[PDB]
Structures are given as structure tokens and as C-alpha cells.
Amino acid sequence: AQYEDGKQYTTLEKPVAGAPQVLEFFSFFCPHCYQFEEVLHISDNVKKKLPEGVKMTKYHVNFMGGDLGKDLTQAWAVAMALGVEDKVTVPLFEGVQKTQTIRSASDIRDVFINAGIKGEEYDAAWNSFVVKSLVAQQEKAAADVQLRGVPAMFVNGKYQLNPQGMDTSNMDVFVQQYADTVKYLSEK
């Protein structure tokens, strides 16, 4: 077959019932995740190749970056609660990996303030139990599939993308192969 288990994707031993339709995991410390956002725009191209209104979920992970890695998961929960993912994703990535100006939770906060989120608004969300629950959902989804590496995408809690099995000579061909595989698994 053109799409084969083990080539463009793998199948989880234990499927996760009730998982989001398209679930991505990333970390701002993850170098390929930087490429996936700034260079390849994987999420946007995947969303485009999916039907209108299909839910896509993107979660941060703790296992990279020690203390600051956990701060960034809580901050991503703040981004999701306020709906400002599209405003902080790039400066958080560049702050961690490019300029390396993010070394504390306050430095993360500065990215949100520079993005236009008010101080009282960020601090209230940061300490809110709505964000606490959002942090738990990110941890629960990662623990559900024993996640040990990022970037990672899961389709309907049963299939895991395998980008190592695609072509990486052409960036644009890789993205299109990746998105078509998500679409293929979506229709399974």
C-alpha cells in the first residue's frame, strides 16, 4: 500500500478513546518544533487539508527544559485560555532558542506583555484554576500515549505520525506528504 503502518505513521499498542481528532505535542525547547512552526508551518498546512471546523489541539510538554519547561506549559495554558496562541508562539520560540532571552517565568511574562496582554490579565490567568485544569489536560494527554519525544501528532488517539519515514530533500514536499498523511488517517 502507498500508506503503510511503520512508514508514514505508526499505530499505538493501546488506543486512547475520546482523544482529540488531531492532537499535536510540542515544546519551545524542541528544535524540530521550531522548524515545524516558523519554517514549515505544519499545523496550518494540516488544518488546510482537513475539513472545515475539525478540531485541532496543540499541547506543550514538560520533559524538556526542567523548571522553565514546566513554566512554559503553564504559560501555554495561559495562551490557550486567553486565545492568544497566534501572538506568543513565535516570540516564545525565538526567546528560548534564537535570542535565548527567556530564562525565567518573568521573561515568559514579558513576551505576553510585549504581545499586548495586560499584566493583570496575564497574572490572573496564570493563577487561575481554569489554567490549572488546562495544565492537567496537557499532562493527561501526553501521559495517555507515554510521550517521550516531540514534535508528535496523533490522529483520533490511534495513529502517530512518522515524519522520519517521509522525504526531507524538499521542505515543501515534506509538508505536503505530512498533511496528506494526516488527511488519510483522518478518513480511516
Ligand SMILES: CCN(CCn1cccn1)C(=O)Cc1ccc(Oc2ccc(C#N)c(C)c2)cc1
Ligand atoms: C520525537 C522524535 N524526535 C525527537 C528526537 N530527535 C531529534 C532529532 C531527531 N530525532 C524528532 O524530532 C522526530 C523528528 C521529526 C521530524 C523530522 O523531520 C524533519 C524535521 C525538520 C525538518 C525541517 N526543516 C524537516 C524537513 C524534516 C525528523 C525527526
